[PDB]
């Protein structure tokens, strides 16, 4: 697997060189943000259940047909699958967020997912919508916690977004 640190290493390796001082300073600062980074993750994990629950409600309100007989979410078993899928995507996203790298996410979570959905007949599009729905709710928590020292999380927030979006895109 890979993450922010490891990555930079690898790059350096192919040049055949010790790390640039400049490059260290990327990592040095990355460290400093850790604490912020962590809390971000913590927030997602803490609210997981909810995030999904929420997103689902909205997805079904929008695309009524999903829950109608003949739709992809019907019946129960299919509905359960749809909920399960949302969780899986989320879980990975979180992982990435901690790593500070998309890779992990791109590998197990998404590589191949789109094709599966097409064969199944689940509308890749609808799933993508849900991924976004999730995104927004999630950010909601990341960005509005309680008992944390107040400061700027934007940097992290955006990176979070990106992860969600890579997801949305590759699925779609």
């Amino acid at each position: 697997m890979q993450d922010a640190f490891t990555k930079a290493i690898v790059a350096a390796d192919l040049r055949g060189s010790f790390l640039s001082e400049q490059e260290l300073n990327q990592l040095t600062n990355l460290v400093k943000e850790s604490n912020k980074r962590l809390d971000a993750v913590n927030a997602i994990t803490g609210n997981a259940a909810e995030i999904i629950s929420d997103a689902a409600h909205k997805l079904f309100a929008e695309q009524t047909d999903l829950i109608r007989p003949g739709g992809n979410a019907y019946p129960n078993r299919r509905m359960a699958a749809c909920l399960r899928d949302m969780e899986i995507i989320l879980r990975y996203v979180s992982y990435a967020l901690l790593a500070g790298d998309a890779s992990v996410l791109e590998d197990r979570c998404l590589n191949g997912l789109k094709e599966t959905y097409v064969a199944l007949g689940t509308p890749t599009r609808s799933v993508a919508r849900a991924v976004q729905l999730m995104k927004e709710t999630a950010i909601g928590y990341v960005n509005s916690p309680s008992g944390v020292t107040r400061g700027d999380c934007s940097a992290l927030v955006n990176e979070a977004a990106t992860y969600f979006d890579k997801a949305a895109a590759s699925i779609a």
Binding site: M1, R84, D107, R108, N111, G112, E115, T116, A119
Partner: protein, 273 residues
């Protein structure tokens, strides 16, 4: 599709391109809206290297998009020989096994359990080997230790998606390929709730195991030869899952861990649930 010549009359490596056709790219000469013909939704042409650039751009500039390109030498090659897997061979570990016989079961177990994937000396597992050969562990129990090992998770399970890891498991622990989406779905769910250890157990625990290569027989390739309750497609799947000897399951290759068995093929053999 089959390509009939590897090289153009003028020297030039032919490449086989596959595209999703679009109405603009080819259309029937009828009145009314332009339609391509349905049977050629995925079209394939063989182009010399020289025309390849222009051909690909034209395809893309229209609504087309390139499913894949592949050298015509690799394509238009024999389907893998099944000589070695038609009759697997089969290894039994007797009780009171010689030093050598235990060795030979260990090797066989690595080869089958890990795909032609190479296992380095540092990767190999002294501790689980140590248990076999003084007794205490079955062949079946050793196999369960391998599929619990990190080495196994690193290759097959941590890089690829669960949907691929499933068939990848079906091959290692049972010669068979998967038959019907139902199977893939059940494993995916079991993994979500029970987690990775339970999933692994469920193959070794299952009745096909024990009914075949029950205990103290290293698992061998059952597919490629007719099995009970095995859809025919499954036999063709096996040809996708198993490419040759000295073909492996590698995380190491470019985009290493993809799905040999297209999801639409599974749905053919049985769709429902």
């Amino acid at each position: 599709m089959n390509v009939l010549t590897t090289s153009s009359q003028r020297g030039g490596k032919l490449f086989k391109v596959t595209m999703t056709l679009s109405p603009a790219l080819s259309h029937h000469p009828w009145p009314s809206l332009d339609t391509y013909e349905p049977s050629q939704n995925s079209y394939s042409v063989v182009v010399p290297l020289d025309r390849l650039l222009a051909e690909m751009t034209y395809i893309k500039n229209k609504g087309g998009r390139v499913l894949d390109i592949s050298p015509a030498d690799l394509e238009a090659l024999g389907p893998p020989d099944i000589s070695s897997v038609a009759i697997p061979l089969k290894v039994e570990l007797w009780a009171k096994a010689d030093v050598s016989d235990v060795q030979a079961a260990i090797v066989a177990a690595y080869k089958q359990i890990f795909g032609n994937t190479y296992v380095l000396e540092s990767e190999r597992l002294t501790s689980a080997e140590s248990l076999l050969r003084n007794g205490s562990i079955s062949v079946r129990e050793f196999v369960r230790l391998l599929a619990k090992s990190e080495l196994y998770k690193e290759r097959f399970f941590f890089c690829t998606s669960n949907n691929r890891f499933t068939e990848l498991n079906f091959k290692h622990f049972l010669g068979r390929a998967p038959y019907n989406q139902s199977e893939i779905a059940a494993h995916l769910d079991r993994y979500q709730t029970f987690g990775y250890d339970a999933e692994i157990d469920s193959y070794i625990d299952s009745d096909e195991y024990i009914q075949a290569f029950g205990e103290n027989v290293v698992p061998y390739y059952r597919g490629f030869k007719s099995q009970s309750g095995q859809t025919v497609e499954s036999f063709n799947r096996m040809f996708k899952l198993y490419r040759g000897d000295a073909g492996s399951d590698t995380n190491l290759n470019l985009q290493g861990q993809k799905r040999r068995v297209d999801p639409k093929n599974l749905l053919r053999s049985g769709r429902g649930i």
